[PDB]
Amino acid sequence: PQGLPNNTASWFTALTQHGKEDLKFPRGQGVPINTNSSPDDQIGYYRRATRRIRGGKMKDLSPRWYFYYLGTGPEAGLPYGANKDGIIWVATEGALNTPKDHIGTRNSANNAAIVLQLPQGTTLPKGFYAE
């Protein structure tokens, strides 16, 4: 079996925002589970992406937050903690403040995104689901 391609460069599926609350995590939480990574790699950001369709004006759909490792993706040039709307920062204890060159971005045409999982007990804002 093969699913439809996800043309985003994030290595993980998005966290869909079903309510009015933006995505945010308490300090030390939010980094997606990746068994092929070390404690040093557990740092990055989520970026809000929005699909837009016409209805007759151009309305938007439920916002989706995609995780990118530190120093990679659409905000590769932003240092950790940099303020920008739609960008929220996450880091597990013990992570290094260095760009994750070795992990990088996903090639959407040949690699499937990993289902975003978070450790049990992770606090999520209202309208978000770990599923």
Author numbering: 42 to 96, 99 to 174
Paper excerpt:
One central protein involved in the formation of regulatory ribonucleoprotein complexes (RNP) is the coronaviral structural protein nucleocapsid (N). N plays a major role in RNA genome replication, translation, and packaging and has further been found to interfere with host-integrated stress responses and stress granule formation.
All crystal structures of nat_mutants with WT-like RNA-binding (nat_mutants P67S, A119S, E136D and P151S) superimpose well with the NTD WT with RMSD values between 0.592 and 1.776 Å. A recent study suggests P151 is part of such an epitope. As our structure shows the NTD fold is unaltered in the P151S mutant, this suggests a respective virus variant may benefit from lowered detection by the immune system, and the same could be true for other loop-located mutations.
